[PDB]
Q: What sequence folds into this?
């Protein structure tokens, strides 16, 4: 969204259909959502403790 | 022009020349011809000169007798824009449509986007012409600058 | 001029779209006559009205 | 092109080089003979007309294979002056192989974006072009589709 | 392919007569003199006829003007060339009277 002057004023995100089943089932040659492996890959001690 | 026109043109150069009789301002003379006659785009001045160097613009001083023809040549570039031509210009900067232009983007437009201008002039041209809300009545600004 | 525009303003003819049930001007000559008097624009006047 | 300098290091990955401009005027191409012909392993292949036999035509493909197809299924090749144009709506001959090969010649040179008139086609590079860092954003500010690649 | 077929043959570009007049009046203020009434249809007719572009590229609708595929880009190129010309010529005036 932009103002009458044209400068950025806000942004709205809308989502339509998350593949909620992908969270539990994936075929060969594909991943689940990236969040899980990116958290696990750094083994960041503060997150690996939390 | 009349023979009495060239004399009063001459004494503009005679006041601007700080030399007792060998100067006329190669860097500043075209800027003054705006006042004595009509006003060009500086690029057209540079095209009649034939695109000199910036160091030439800062160091060179030219000879007046060759400049008398330049007075007419710089006067020659017709199809200058009229009042309606100018007033429809700043409306594209007007993102409201009511007849005001905010000076925060008006000075920005005049400084950044067209030909170069000496910025202090941009500060002082609109100074005193603003309103309390911080805008300009550009149809007045155009009928100001076309007249005087 | 404002009295005159209130006269012209009744001469604006509107027509329903074949499926949207939305008003669009057929009588654009009366709407641009009105806007010319009130100092609006024919398009944004018609868009605002409809 | 001297104006390409505004994109910095991203410039080679958006528009063809000056050599490709000069090569285009020197390519061997005959508008009446150069045509696309369908193939099995690949949808279309360039081919060269060798003879005319009324309603039946015979031609030799770029791989030296002989083919015979009726004139209803043969499509003239686009001249090299329109190769890799940035907007496929400006193609002179528009058909399935003209778009296929217009995408293929651009994509093989990592020029991944191409317009198609009112809409645009982007082909997945799979390897990065430094075409997404802050410096190009400034080059795209206020520029129109006629100006920027 | 079909979308190109329609873009090349058809009239993909379209403007309301009022927004056309409002935006591109900067292209020829004399074709649409203000201070006097002129219907949206005949005004757009005179302005576009004055542009000297290929007249086979457009046709007029009941409420929108219609252009061939490649015209609208050329009109925006034309308008920004004019806006550059004019903001520099208003600067011609600004410098001229400021120097006065
Ligand atoms: C059909 C569509 C592509 N279109 C146009 O063809 C022109 C529009 N508006 C005009 C006023 C305009 C032209 C060019 C740039 C900005 C705006 N709107 C539109 O929706």
A:
């Amino acid at each position: 969204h932009f103002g009458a002057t044209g400068k950025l004023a806000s942004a709205d995100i809308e989502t339509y259909l998350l593949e909620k089943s992908r969270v539990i089932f994936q075929l060969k040659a594909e991943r689940d959502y990236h969040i899980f492996y990116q958290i696990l890959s750094n083994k960041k001690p503060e997150l690996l403790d939390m | 022009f009349s023979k009495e026109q060239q004399e009063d043109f001459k004494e503009a150069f005679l006041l601007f020349d700080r030399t007792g009789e060998c100067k006329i301002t190669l860097s500043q003379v075209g800027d003054v011809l705006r006042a004595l006659g009509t006003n060009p785009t500086n690029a057209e001045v540079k095209k009649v000169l034939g695109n000199p160097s910036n160091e030439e613009m800062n160091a060179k001083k030219i000879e007046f007798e060759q400049f008398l023809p330049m007075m007419q040549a710089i006067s020659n570039n017709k199809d200058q824009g009229g009042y309606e031509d100018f007033v429809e210009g700043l409306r594209v900067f007007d993102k409201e449509g009511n007849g005001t232009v905010m000076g925060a983007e008006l000075r920005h437009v005049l400084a950044t986007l067209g030909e170069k201008m000496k910025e202090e002039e941009v500060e002082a041209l609109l100074a005193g012409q603003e309103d309390s809300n911080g805008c300009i009545n550009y149809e007045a600004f155009v009928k100001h600058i076309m007249s005087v | 001029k404002l009295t005159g525009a209130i006269m012209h303003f009744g001469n604006m003819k509107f027509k329903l779209k074949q499926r949207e049930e939305q008003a669009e001007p057929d009588g654009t000559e009366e709407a641009d006559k009105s806007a010319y008097l009130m100092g609006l624009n024919s398009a944004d006047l018609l868009k605002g009205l409809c | 092109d001297s104006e390409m300098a505004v994109f910095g290091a991203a410039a080679p990955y958006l528009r063809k080089s000056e050599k490709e401009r000069l090569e285009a005027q020197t390519r061997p191409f005959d508008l009446k003979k150069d045509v696309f012909v369908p193939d099995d392993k690949q949808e279309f292949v360039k081919a060269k007309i060798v003879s005319r036999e009324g309603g039946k035509v015979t031609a030799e493909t770029e791989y030296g294979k002989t083919v015979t197809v009726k004139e209803d299924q043969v499509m003239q090749q686009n001249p090299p002056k329109f190769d890799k144009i940035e907007d496929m709506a400006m193609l002179t001959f528009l058909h399935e192989p003209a778009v296929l090969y217009n995408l293929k010649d651009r994509y093989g040179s990592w020029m991944i974006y191409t317009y198609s008139g009112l809409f645009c086609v982007t082909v997945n590079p799979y390897k990065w072009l430094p075409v997404y860092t802050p410096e190009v954003v400034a080059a795209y500010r206020g520029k129109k589709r006629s100006e920027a690649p | 392919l079909e979308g190109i077929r329609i873009c090349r043959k058809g009239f993909p570009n379209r403007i309301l007569y009022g927004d056309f007049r409002q935006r591109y009046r900067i292209l020829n203020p004399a074709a649409i003199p203000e201070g006097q009434f002129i219907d949206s249809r005949k005004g757009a007719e005179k302005l576009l006829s004055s542009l000297d572009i290929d007249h086979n590229q457009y046709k007029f609708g009941h409420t929108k003007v219609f252009f061939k595929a490649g015209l609208l880009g050329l009109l925006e190129e034309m308008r920004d060339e004019r806006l550059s010309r004019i903001i520099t010529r208003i600067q011609a005036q600004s410098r001229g009277v400021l120097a006065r």
